[PDB]
Amino acid sequence: EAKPKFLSKAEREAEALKRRQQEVEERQRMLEE
Amino acid sequence: ELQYYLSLLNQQLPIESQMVSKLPDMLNAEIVLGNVQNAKDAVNWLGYAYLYIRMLRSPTLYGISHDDLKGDPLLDQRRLDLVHTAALMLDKNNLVKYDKKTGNFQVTELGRIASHYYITNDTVQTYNQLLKPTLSEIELFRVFSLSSEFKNITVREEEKLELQKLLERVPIPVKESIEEPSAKINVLLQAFISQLKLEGFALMADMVYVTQSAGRLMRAIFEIVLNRGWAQLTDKTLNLCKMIDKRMWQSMCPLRQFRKLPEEVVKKIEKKNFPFERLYDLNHNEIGELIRMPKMGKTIHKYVHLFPKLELSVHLQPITRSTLKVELTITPDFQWDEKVHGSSEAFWILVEDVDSEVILHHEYFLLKAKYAQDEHLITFFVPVFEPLPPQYFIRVVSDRWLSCETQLPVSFRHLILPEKYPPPTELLDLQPLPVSALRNSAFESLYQDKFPFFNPIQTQVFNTVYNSDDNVFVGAPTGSGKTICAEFAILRMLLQSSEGRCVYITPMEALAEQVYMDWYEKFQDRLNKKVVLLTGETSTDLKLLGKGNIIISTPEKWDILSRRWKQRKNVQNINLFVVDEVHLIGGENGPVLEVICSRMRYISSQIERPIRIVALSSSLSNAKDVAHWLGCSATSTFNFHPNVRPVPLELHIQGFNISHTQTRLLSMAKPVYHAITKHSPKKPVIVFVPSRKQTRLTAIDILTTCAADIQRQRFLHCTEKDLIPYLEKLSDSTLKETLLNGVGYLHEGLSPMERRLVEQLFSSGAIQVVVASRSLCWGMNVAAHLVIIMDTQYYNGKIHAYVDYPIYDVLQMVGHANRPLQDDEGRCVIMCQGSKKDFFKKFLYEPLPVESHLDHCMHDHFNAEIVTKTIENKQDAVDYLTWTFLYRRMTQNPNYYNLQGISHRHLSDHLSELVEQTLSDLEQSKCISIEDEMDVAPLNLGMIAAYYYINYTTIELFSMSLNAKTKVRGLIEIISNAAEYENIPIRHHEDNLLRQLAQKVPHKLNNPKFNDPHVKTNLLLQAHLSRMQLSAELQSDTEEILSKAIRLIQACVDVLSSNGWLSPALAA
Amino acid sequence: SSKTEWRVRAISAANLHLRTNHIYVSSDDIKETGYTYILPKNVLKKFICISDLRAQIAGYLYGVSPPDNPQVKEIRCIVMVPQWGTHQTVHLPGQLPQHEYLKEMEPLGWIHTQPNESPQLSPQDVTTHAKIMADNPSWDGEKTIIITCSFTPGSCTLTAYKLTPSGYEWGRQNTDKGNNPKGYLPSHYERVQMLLSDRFLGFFMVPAQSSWNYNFMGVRHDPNMKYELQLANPKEFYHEVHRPSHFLNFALVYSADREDLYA
Amino acid sequence: KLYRAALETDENLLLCAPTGAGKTNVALMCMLREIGKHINMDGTINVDDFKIIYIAPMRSLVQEMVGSFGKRLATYGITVAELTGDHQLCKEEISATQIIVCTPEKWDIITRKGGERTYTQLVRLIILDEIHLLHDDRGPVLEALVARAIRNIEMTQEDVRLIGLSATLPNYEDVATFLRVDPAKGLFYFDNSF
């Protein structure tokens, strides 16, 4: 949003891991297509 | 021929001057060396040679009749005719621009390359008319063989069979026929490069002479291709020069250039198609087993480790939308040896586009043996156009070693370039506001005798400054009258409230002292207002803020008061916040001013009182981000253009192709005097010198250049009777002798009273030249017509490199020559290197954008926020960092702030990572406590660092280096090794004085380093404690050390009292 | 001969720079239904000056579609794999290049220089494209094109060509390398629209170990040899490193030795 | 006969002596007179305060003169070196040594490139040996070097002792006037009988 919500290092690492897993799933779906 | 042999063996053969053949070459060499500039100087240089004496003694041998000798006894007409013929030969060969009207000659790059390589005029003309950027390697040999050095070399009919045999063995094909001398010279060069055995002795001598000419010809061709910008032609010329120097083909082995390698092992390595990079990864046994030679495997491994191959790393940062800053870190990955590499290794680094045809940035790097095995960082400016390439290529090749080149692809695919800059606020063509436009008569009485009408930018800003109270961002160049707008805003704040509290923050201490001295005569003398200046003492600063209405301060002085704004009610009850020169908020004292502005913007939105913020700075391109970060409105943003100054500035750039800084400073003395004589003959001039000791040398060189010509003592517009009371007050006899001729000097080592006397002598018009140091650029209360800034660099001894001058000091030196009534315009001649000419030309007319560098110095701001109970959690720290200028600069330039996107999630993750790094740096230094990785608590060390304005690293060093049994000799070394002593100036010729003073100190230093600033601070503290004698440059550093040594001793005493130590506290 | 023809080829390639100043595109018989080619001018100029008038030079073009425009394909990267082609065919290696730069763009096909301009597509090129498509599943039968950049007098005539599924099947089934092999039909190839541009610059990839040029040494070239590509500018066909045999062949002092001259 | 003009007098001398008449002795006396200004009684000699340039036309003759200067001035610590290599190597050899034996073409190239501008104030002894090639192909290069030296002595007022050695040739008065040598004390014209 407008106000930047501060997160921890572990929460940011978990968000980056979830984004990488979503990108890997999108790449696997694109490869299957 | 028996008579002439009888003439030389019996003293009967007079020596006849044959200087008419190389007279245009000598004229071009004298024009490139700076000895001759016009036709009169060329005639005077020709008259001092032996050719004029031979023409005067024997005119019949020189082709002069008796009537020409009778009509010209001094041989001036024949010398003028020879100078005109040499000028016509130089202009026809495009070597030097020679005008027939005035007779002045300007040396071009082709003439300088011909003089530096001893090339002829016809060869230079053939190289200028023959070399194309789309030329291949086959045409390059034909262009090099068609020079004027081989004009007398003929193709003999007896050597036609040898040329036909060598035509089938040369690796470079020749397009010309066998009867042409150019193809014969190309075949001879191919035979000398490939070490082909010849048969004819005269053909071998012609090939040796052709190679001895072609070495300098290829060097001049490589210089001309580097000056022209053709990247592929320069690469081919460098390959041809390396093949001519190493006497080997480009496809040969890299060990052939080393004379210690056997020929049979080199032939066995060349027989196997293996790259040279694969041999570096192998060991001494694997390289011996791969080439089937285990005895020579260790020698091959030593030759691979001794071959020049360095690792290059690229760091790109887009500063503007058209140019970026590229930092190249070069790490030597080879064993440096004096028998292989020597004292230094020269390399050429060329950064070009994806097409590899236009060299965008060409430079040289001389890695010395003393600076070997260390990564050197070279900063360059790379331009970028609207068709942005996916990647640029930075090729660093070896200038002496063949087949030693490292290529770095700098990718621009994921480069987050900033957006387009908004147009600046143009000055409307309105009527100038008179002195009667103001309401208060006391405010108009302080500016009636100064000027009857204000500036047009001041007339446009008076409607938003005097008739309003909002935050106004005034981006005006140095000399446009920002002080008049600041005085109008102060008068509006005084008319709105008579008991107001105005605070004017300026980064430079000398500029703040000048502003305080101006306000003492303008606001305190004519309006009777309490105008005070803040000091470095926190006890008197509160009384000066409570009793003063106009407080001039520094960001380093106001950061101690803004850190306790919740407790101090006088800082919360402010009426006006003026911030002068905010454009220097991205350099020295840069994040401190931004942190003070963010603290003022946070306290203005939390104390129920909107303070009038007036941010006066230079013309910035990204002024919208600075207006949004300071709360300025869109109508109050008076960001003018750099070309909208009242005094028109004519900016000239003198690029000198000199790698050494001392050689460039020695060579740029006479062009500086030539530019001073050509631009402003009867006007005062200010010469910006690189160093303090170089200012007296530049003044002596200017005095010698003035006394060499007929205009002796032309810089002294006054008489000696008016300067005799002025020269009697100076201490240096050399400075008084230079000021007697009209050339004053000013440096950091000079006295302040002597500097004030020199400024009063230069402002009155007695002297015409003022050689001021680079540190006295901002601290100069004078305005001249010409500003010659010579060699804008500094030889830093802490890194031992010639670091370039910052843009803020260059802008201050450009704006220092702002004469509104004394001169109609202002000349600014920046004489620097050729690589820094494009950046200085781009940062002069275009507005310089502001870039927040608060990420490198966020630890002290985080400690000050946590100690004042402001940033108590992670969200509070994120909200405090979001209100600063770094959050506004990250949204405009993500790649400059090391971000990967302008999205909210990526910026939030970057802010969380920065907050976590700051919390880890605070917890590792025992300055803060992290409760559940979310809450921040100030510790004792962090509160002691924020109270005495100390860094976290210095507080951690004082906490980990002071024990319960410490002494004074250990406490002095602990205070000298603090973070505040790392900013000590380290220049050339300073290690010998430190080594001489280290033997007289009362306390010895365990393994002292001549390049470390902590050892210099310890030596200065030992000299100040023992009251020993020192130089002026040492005393100028000792005073800056002792200015913070009291706060360092107070922090050490607080750390000793907090740890429960009585005897180390008493020793401190 | 490879004795005097090498010099003629080098001289002709020296003047091949001017041939890039005049580029013509055979915009005719375009289906106007498939994706368009947006090959940039810089990449074409680079690939035209690194080709020989006798030996055909081929390179794999990979790119991506412009945003919000799926009806066009922009070839943004060209990689020159080490190959040694003749005047009528190209012996491209069987290893499909892979790199970090190419990990974001799909293969757009191959571009082969043609020393002569022919009205009909070469059956050998069609067969090679079909074999490459069958071997490498990455290349599609409806997204890969064969840019037959022909050579013209004073000009570099360019033309795009796409293989029909029937043509791909015929090329995969056929294995003879004759001049007019059986199964080649005019319906096998279909020209596609190709437009040059000067708005987006192209990327060039060259092998990290060896050079892209391999016509000067057919023994070193291997049809199954693996290749490692990296972002670099390819060298010319008649380069010093392209022909090691012509360079390192000569075998290894009483003349006039002038020392300390003016240099 | 010219001992007081090369050791006791620092003026520009013109020695017109034939080949084999001890032409190196006058250059050694001029080098000893140039080193006599830097006494250094605490040490041996101050070699970082003066420089002696030796203009030799042949490279082997320049190497022989550098070897003779290294063998003769070994007790004084005068570093005799040959200016060769690149521009940076020649600048390092000029900044690291005192006696520099080089060609007139190499000295002209170093003056035009700027490698001797930083060490121009320390060079106070210019020994131009074998000036009898002033009509040869090395003529205009040595003439331009002498003109640059005369312009530096007239403009920058740098007193440089110029010792020009030539063979027994006529019209030596013009060569003495071109080298700023005095006709009485600086001019030494020896015939073939010497």
PDB file of N, CA, C and O in Angstrom, chain B residues 8 11-19 22 26 33 45 48-50 53-54 57 115-116 663 704 708, chain D residues 109 111-114 117-118 132 134-136 140 143-144 146-147 150 155-156 168-171 174 178 192:
ATOM      1  N   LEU B   8      86.748  16.469 -45.244  1.00  0.00           N
ATOM      2  CA  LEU B   8      86.424  16.118 -43.867  1.00  0.00           C
ATOM      3  C   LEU B   8      87.654  15.682 -43.081  1.00  0.00           C
ATOM      4  O   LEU B   8      87.662  15.775 -41.848  1.00  0.00           O
ATOM      5  N   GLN B  11      89.805  19.374 -42.390  1.00  0.00           N
ATOM      6  CA  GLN B  11      89.028  20.520 -41.897  1.00  0.00           C
ATOM      7  C   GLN B  11      88.728  21.527 -43.009  1.00  0.00           C
ATOM      8  O   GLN B  11      89.082  22.704 -42.930  1.00  0.00           O
ATOM      9  N   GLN B  12      88.064  21.044 -44.064  1.00  0.00           N
ATOM     10  CA  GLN B  12      87.703  21.883 -45.199  1.00  0.00           C
ATOM     11  C   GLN B  12      86.243  21.724 -45.606  1.00  0.00           C
ATOM     12  O   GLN B  12      85.853  22.218 -46.673  1.00  0.00           O
ATOM     13  N   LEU B  13      85.426  21.055 -44.794  1.00  0.00           N
ATOM     14  CA  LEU B  13      84.009  20.868 -45.091  1.00  0.00           C
ATOM     15  C   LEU B  13      83.168  21.580 -44.042  1.00  0.00           C
ATOM     16  O   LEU B  13      83.000  21.063 -42.927  1.00  0.00           O
ATOM     17  N   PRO B  14      82.644  22.770 -44.331  1.00  0.00           N
ATOM     18  CA  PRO B  14      81.792  23.458 -43.355  1.00  0.00           C
ATOM     19  C   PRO B  14      80.445  22.770 -43.210  1.00  0.00           C
ATOM     20  O   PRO B  14      79.912  22.183 -44.155  1.00  0.00           O
ATOM     21  N   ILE B  15      79.895  22.844 -42.003  1.00  0.00           N
ATOM     22  CA  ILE B  15      78.616  22.214 -41.689  1.00  0.00           C
ATOM     23  C   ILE B  15      77.505  23.153 -42.141  1.00  0.00           C
ATOM     24  O   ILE B  15      77.336  24.244 -41.586  1.00  0.00           O
ATOM     25  N   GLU B  16      76.744  22.730 -43.145  1.00  0.00           N
ATOM     26  CA  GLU B  16      75.634  23.510 -43.675  1.00  0.00           C
ATOM     27  C   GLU B  16      74.341  23.071 -43.004  1.00  0.00           C
ATOM     28  O   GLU B  16      74.087  21.871 -42.857  1.00  0.00           O
ATOM     29  N   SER B  17      73.529  24.045 -42.597  1.00  0.00           N
ATOM     30  CA  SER B  17      72.270  23.750 -41.926  1.00  0.00           C
ATOM     31  C   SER B  17      71.241  23.262 -42.939  1.00  0.00           C
ATOM     32  O   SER B  17      70.854  24.001 -43.851  1.00  0.00           O
ATOM     33  N   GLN B  18      70.800  22.018 -42.778  1.00  0.00           N
ATOM     34  CA  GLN B  18      69.799  21.405 -43.645  1.00  0.00           C
ATOM     35  C   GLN B  18      68.442  21.336 -42.954  1.00  0.00           C
ATOM     36  O   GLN B  18      67.689  20.374 -43.115  1.00  0.00           O
ATOM     37  N   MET B  19      68.114  22.367 -42.174  1.00  0.00           N
ATOM     38  CA  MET B  19      66.877  22.405 -41.404  1.00  0.00           C
ATOM     39  C   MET B  19      65.657  22.792 -42.232  1.00  0.00           C
ATOM     40  O   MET B  19      64.553  22.846 -41.682  1.00  0.00           O
ATOM     41  N   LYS B  22      63.037  19.619 -42.545  1.00  0.00           N
ATOM     42  CA  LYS B  22      62.205  19.291 -41.396  1.00  0.00           C
ATOM     43  C   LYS B  22      61.699  20.542 -40.681  1.00  0.00           C
ATOM     44  O   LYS B  22      61.450  20.518 -39.474  1.00  0.00           O
ATOM     45  N   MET B  26      59.464  20.719 -37.417  1.00  0.00           N
ATOM     46  CA  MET B  26      59.925  21.459 -36.246  1.00  0.00           C
ATOM     47  C   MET B  26      58.899  22.498 -35.808  1.00  0.00           C
ATOM     48  O   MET B  26      58.728  22.738 -34.607  1.00  0.00           O
ATOM     49  N   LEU B  33      54.446  21.527 -28.454  1.00  0.00           N
ATOM     50  CA  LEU B  33      55.124  21.710 -27.177  1.00  0.00           C
ATOM     51  C   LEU B  33      54.762  23.020 -26.491  1.00  0.00           C
ATOM     52  O   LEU B  33      55.100  23.199 -25.317  1.00  0.00           O
ATOM     53  N   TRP B  45      61.513  31.553 -32.468  1.00  0.00           N
ATOM     54  CA  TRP B  45      62.067  30.219 -32.268  1.00  0.00           C
ATOM     55  C   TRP B  45      62.969  29.808 -33.425  1.00  0.00           C
ATOM     56  O   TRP B  45      63.953  29.087 -33.216  1.00  0.00           O
ATOM     57  N   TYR B  48      66.525  31.556 -33.136  1.00  0.00           N
ATOM     58  CA  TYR B  48      67.446  31.023 -32.141  1.00  0.00           C
ATOM     59  C   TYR B  48      68.099  29.717 -32.572  1.00  0.00           C
ATOM     60  O   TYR B  48      68.933  29.188 -31.830  1.00  0.00           O
ATOM     61  N   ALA B  49      67.746  29.189 -33.739  1.00  0.00           N
ATOM     62  CA  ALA B  49      68.308  27.939 -34.223  1.00  0.00           C
ATOM     63  C   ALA B  49      69.556  28.195 -35.065  1.00  0.00           C
ATOM     64  O   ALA B  49      69.936  29.338 -35.335  1.00  0.00           O
ATOM     65  N   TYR B  50      70.199  27.103 -35.481  1.00  0.00           N
ATOM     66  CA  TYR B  50      71.411  27.199 -36.284  1.00  0.00           C
ATOM     67  C   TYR B  50      71.130  27.533 -37.742  1.00  0.00           C
ATOM     68  O   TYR B  50      72.048  27.960 -38.451  1.00  0.00           O
ATOM     69  N   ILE B  53      71.419  31.298 -38.153  1.00  0.00           N
ATOM     70  CA  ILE B  53      72.822  31.695 -38.092  1.00  0.00           C
ATOM     71  C   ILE B  53      73.552  31.305 -39.372  1.00  0.00           C
ATOM     72  O   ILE B  53      74.437  32.034 -39.836  1.00  0.00           O
ATOM     73  N   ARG B  54      73.192  30.163 -39.969  1.00  0.00           N
ATOM     74  CA  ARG B  54      73.795  29.772 -41.239  1.00  0.00           C
ATOM     75  C   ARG B  54      73.303  30.644 -42.389  1.00  0.00           C
ATOM     76  O   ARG B  54      74.055  30.899 -43.334  1.00  0.00           O
ATOM     77  N   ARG B  57      75.224  34.010 -41.815  1.00  0.00           N
ATOM     78  CA  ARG B  57      76.646  33.923 -42.127  1.00  0.00           C
ATOM     79  C   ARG B  57      76.880  33.615 -43.600  1.00  0.00           C
ATOM     80  O   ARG B  57      77.758  34.218 -44.230  1.00  0.00           O
ATOM     81  N   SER B 115      53.755  14.848 -33.735  1.00  0.00           N
ATOM     82  CA  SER B 115      54.908  15.319 -32.977  1.00  0.00           C
ATOM     83  C   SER B 115      55.319  14.333 -31.892  1.00  0.00           C
ATOM     84  O   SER B 115      56.515  14.193 -31.612  1.00  0.00           O
ATOM     85  N   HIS B 116      54.359  13.640 -31.280  1.00  0.00           N
ATOM     86  CA  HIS B 116      54.675  12.672 -30.238  1.00  0.00           C
ATOM     87  C   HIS B 116      55.214  11.360 -30.794  1.00  0.00           C
ATOM     88  O   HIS B 116      55.769  10.563 -30.030  1.00  0.00           O
ATOM     89  N   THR B 663      52.586  15.477 -14.293  1.00  0.00           N
ATOM     90  CA  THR B 663      52.975  15.890 -15.638  1.00  0.00           C
ATOM     91  C   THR B 663      51.898  16.752 -16.285  1.00  0.00           C
ATOM     92  O   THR B 663      52.211  17.715 -16.994  1.00  0.00           O
ATOM     93  N   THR B 704      56.416  33.551 -14.198  1.00  0.00           N
ATOM     94  CA  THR B 704      57.469  33.299 -15.176  1.00  0.00           C
ATOM     95  C   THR B 704      56.946  33.425 -16.603  1.00  0.00           C
ATOM     96  O   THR B 704      57.665  33.893 -17.494  1.00  0.00           O
ATOM     97  N   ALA B 708      58.293  36.189 -19.142  1.00  0.00           N
ATOM     98  CA  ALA B 708      58.944  35.686 -20.348  1.00  0.00           C
ATOM     99  C   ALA B 708      58.560  36.513 -21.568  1.00  0.00           C
ATOM    100  O   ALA B 708      59.385  36.728 -22.465  1.00  0.00           O
TER     101      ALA B 708
ATOM    102  N   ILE D 109      62.050  13.303 -29.156  1.00  0.00           N
ATOM    103  CA  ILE D 109      60.775  12.613 -28.989  1.00  0.00           C
ATOM    104  C   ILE D 109      60.312  12.663 -27.538  1.00  0.00           C
ATOM    105  O   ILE D 109      59.110  12.769 -27.269  1.00  0.00           O
ATOM    106  N   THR D 111      61.062  15.122 -25.490  1.00  0.00           N
ATOM    107  CA  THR D 111      60.670  16.505 -25.243  1.00  0.00           C
ATOM    108  C   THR D 111      59.317  16.816 -25.874  1.00  0.00           C
ATOM    109  O   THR D 111      58.527  17.587 -25.316  1.00  0.00           O
ATOM    110  N   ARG D 112      59.034  16.228 -27.039  1.00  0.00           N
ATOM    111  CA  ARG D 112      57.752  16.454 -27.696  1.00  0.00           C
ATOM    112  C   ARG D 112      56.619  15.685 -27.024  1.00  0.00           C
ATOM    113  O   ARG D 112      55.486  16.179 -26.975  1.00  0.00           O
ATOM    114  N   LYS D 113      56.898  14.487 -26.507  1.00  0.00           N
ATOM    115  CA  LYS D 113      55.859  13.717 -25.832  1.00  0.00           C
ATOM    116  C   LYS D 113      55.587  14.250 -24.431  1.00  0.00           C
ATOM    117  O   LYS D 113      54.490  14.047 -23.895  1.00  0.00           O
ATOM    118  N   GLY D 114      56.561  14.923 -23.827  1.00  0.00           N
ATOM    119  CA  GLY D 114      56.406  15.472 -22.498  1.00  0.00           C
ATOM    120  C   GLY D 114      56.966  14.630 -21.375  1.00  0.00           C
ATOM    121  O   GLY D 114      56.636  14.885 -20.211  1.00  0.00           O
ATOM    122  N   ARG D 117      59.444  16.933 -19.142  1.00  0.00           N
ATOM    123  CA  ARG D 117      59.004  18.234 -18.648  1.00  0.00           C
ATOM    124  C   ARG D 117      59.053  18.304 -17.127  1.00  0.00           C
ATOM    125  O   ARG D 117      59.308  19.375 -16.566  1.00  0.00           O
ATOM    126  N   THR D 118      58.808  17.182 -16.446  1.00  0.00           N
ATOM    127  CA  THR D 118      58.855  17.161 -14.990  1.00  0.00           C
ATOM    128  C   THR D 118      60.280  17.153 -14.450  1.00  0.00           C
ATOM    129  O   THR D 118      60.490  17.529 -13.291  1.00  0.00           O
ATOM    130  N   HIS D 132      79.387  17.188 -35.284  1.00  0.00           N
ATOM    131  CA  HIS D 132      79.821  17.229 -36.680  1.00  0.00           C
ATOM    132  C   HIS D 132      78.797  16.631 -37.635  1.00  0.00           C
ATOM    133  O   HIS D 132      78.902  16.844 -38.848  1.00  0.00           O
ATOM    134  N   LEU D 134      75.867  17.784 -37.699  1.00  0.00           N
ATOM    135  CA  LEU D 134      74.875  18.851 -37.803  1.00  0.00           C
ATOM    136  C   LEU D 134      74.429  19.099 -39.239  1.00  0.00           C
ATOM    137  O   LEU D 134      73.371  19.702 -39.450  1.00  0.00           O
ATOM    138  N   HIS D 135      75.213  18.668 -40.227  1.00  0.00           N
ATOM    139  CA  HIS D 135      74.793  18.696 -41.620  1.00  0.00           C
ATOM    140  C   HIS D 135      74.213  17.368 -42.086  1.00  0.00           C
ATOM    141  O   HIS D 135      73.751  17.277 -43.229  1.00  0.00           O
ATOM    142  N   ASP D 136      74.224  16.345 -41.233  1.00  0.00           N
ATOM    143  CA  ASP D 136      73.738  15.018 -41.577  1.00  0.00           C
ATOM    144  C   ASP D 136      72.229  14.933 -41.341  1.00  0.00           C
ATOM    145  O   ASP D 136      71.541  15.946 -41.183  1.00  0.00           O
ATOM    146  N   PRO D 140      68.556  18.613 -38.350  1.00  0.00           N
ATOM    147  CA  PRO D 140      67.393  19.391 -37.882  1.00  0.00           C
ATOM    148  C   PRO D 140      66.854  18.973 -36.523  1.00  0.00           C
ATOM    149  O   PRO D 140      66.290  19.819 -35.819  1.00  0.00           O
ATOM    150  N   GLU D 143      69.137  20.657 -34.151  1.00  0.00           N
ATOM    151  CA  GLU D 143      68.890  22.091 -34.268  1.00  0.00           C
ATOM    152  C   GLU D 143      67.613  22.498 -33.540  1.00  0.00           C
ATOM    153  O   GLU D 143      67.583  23.530 -32.862  1.00  0.00           O
ATOM    154  N   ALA D 144      66.559  21.685 -33.649  1.00  0.00           N
ATOM    155  CA  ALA D 144      65.327  21.953 -32.916  1.00  0.00           C
ATOM    156  C   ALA D 144      65.513  21.763 -31.417  1.00  0.00           C
ATOM    157  O   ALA D 144      64.920  22.505 -30.627  1.00  0.00           O
ATOM    158  N   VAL D 146      68.389  22.330 -29.814  1.00  0.00           N
ATOM    159  CA  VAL D 146      69.162  23.491 -29.382  1.00  0.00           C
ATOM    160  C   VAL D 146      68.289  24.742 -29.360  1.00  0.00           C
ATOM    161  O   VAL D 146      68.445  25.606 -28.489  1.00  0.00           O
ATOM    162  N   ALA D 147      67.343  24.848 -30.298  1.00  0.00           N
ATOM    163  CA  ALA D 147      66.425  25.985 -30.306  1.00  0.00           C
ATOM    164  C   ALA D 147      65.460  25.926 -29.128  1.00  0.00           C
ATOM    165  O   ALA D 147      65.142  26.962 -28.532  1.00  0.00           O
ATOM    166  N   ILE D 150      67.491  26.952 -26.112  1.00  0.00           N
ATOM    167  CA  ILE D 150      67.713  28.395 -26.101  1.00  0.00           C
ATOM    168  C   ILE D 150      66.436  29.134 -25.720  1.00  0.00           C
ATOM    169  O   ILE D 150      66.479  30.137 -24.998  1.00  0.00           O
ATOM    170  N   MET D 155      63.347  32.196 -21.899  1.00  0.00           N
ATOM    171  CA  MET D 155      62.023  32.446 -21.338  1.00  0.00           C
ATOM    172  C   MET D 155      61.959  32.088 -19.856  1.00  0.00           C
ATOM    173  O   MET D 155      61.620  32.931 -19.019  1.00  0.00           O
ATOM    174  N   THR D 156      62.281  30.838 -19.516  1.00  0.00           N
ATOM    175  CA  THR D 156      62.205  30.380 -18.136  1.00  0.00           C
ATOM    176  C   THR D 156      63.438  30.737 -17.316  1.00  0.00           C
ATOM    177  O   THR D 156      63.440  30.472 -16.108  1.00  0.00           O
ATOM    178  N   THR D 168      86.854  18.761 -36.194  1.00  0.00           N
ATOM    179  CA  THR D 168      87.570  19.880 -36.805  1.00  0.00           C
ATOM    180  C   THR D 168      86.891  20.233 -38.123  1.00  0.00           C
ATOM    181  O   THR D 168      87.172  19.634 -39.162  1.00  0.00           O
ATOM    182  N   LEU D 169      85.993  21.213 -38.082  1.00  0.00           N
ATOM    183  CA  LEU D 169      85.227  21.636 -39.241  1.00  0.00           C
ATOM    184  C   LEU D 169      85.224  23.155 -39.316  1.00  0.00           C
ATOM    185  O   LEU D 169      85.275  23.829 -38.280  1.00  0.00           O
ATOM    186  N   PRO D 170      85.179  23.721 -40.522  1.00  0.00           N
ATOM    187  CA  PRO D 170      85.096  25.179 -40.655  1.00  0.00           C
ATOM    188  C   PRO D 170      83.728  25.705 -40.246  1.00  0.00           C
ATOM    189  O   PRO D 170      82.790  24.947 -39.978  1.00  0.00           O
ATOM    190  N   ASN D 171      83.641  27.044 -40.216  1.00  0.00           N
ATOM    191  CA  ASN D 171      82.443  27.800 -39.813  1.00  0.00           C
ATOM    192  C   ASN D 171      81.982  27.416 -38.408  1.00  0.00           C
ATOM    193  O   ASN D 171      80.790  27.226 -38.154  1.00  0.00           O
ATOM    194  N   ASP D 174      79.564  30.105 -36.253  1.00  0.00           N
ATOM    195  CA  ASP D 174      78.109  30.015 -36.315  1.00  0.00           C
ATOM    196  C   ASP D 174      77.576  28.907 -35.413  1.00  0.00           C
ATOM    197  O   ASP D 174      76.495  29.052 -34.831  1.00  0.00           O
ATOM    198  N   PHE D 178      75.171  29.565 -32.302  1.00  0.00           N
ATOM    199  CA  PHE D 178      73.908  28.841 -32.225  1.00  0.00           C
ATOM    200  C   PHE D 178      73.772  28.073 -30.917  1.00  0.00           C
ATOM    201  O   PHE D 178      72.654  27.889 -30.423  1.00  0.00           O
ATOM    202  N   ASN D 192      93.900  19.524 -36.841  1.00  0.00           N
ATOM    203  CA  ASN D 192      94.239  18.111 -36.962  1.00  0.00           C
ATOM    204  C   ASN D 192      95.557  17.766 -36.278  1.00  0.00           C
ATOM    205  O   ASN D 192      95.821  16.585 -36.033  1.00  0.00           O
TER     206      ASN D 192
END
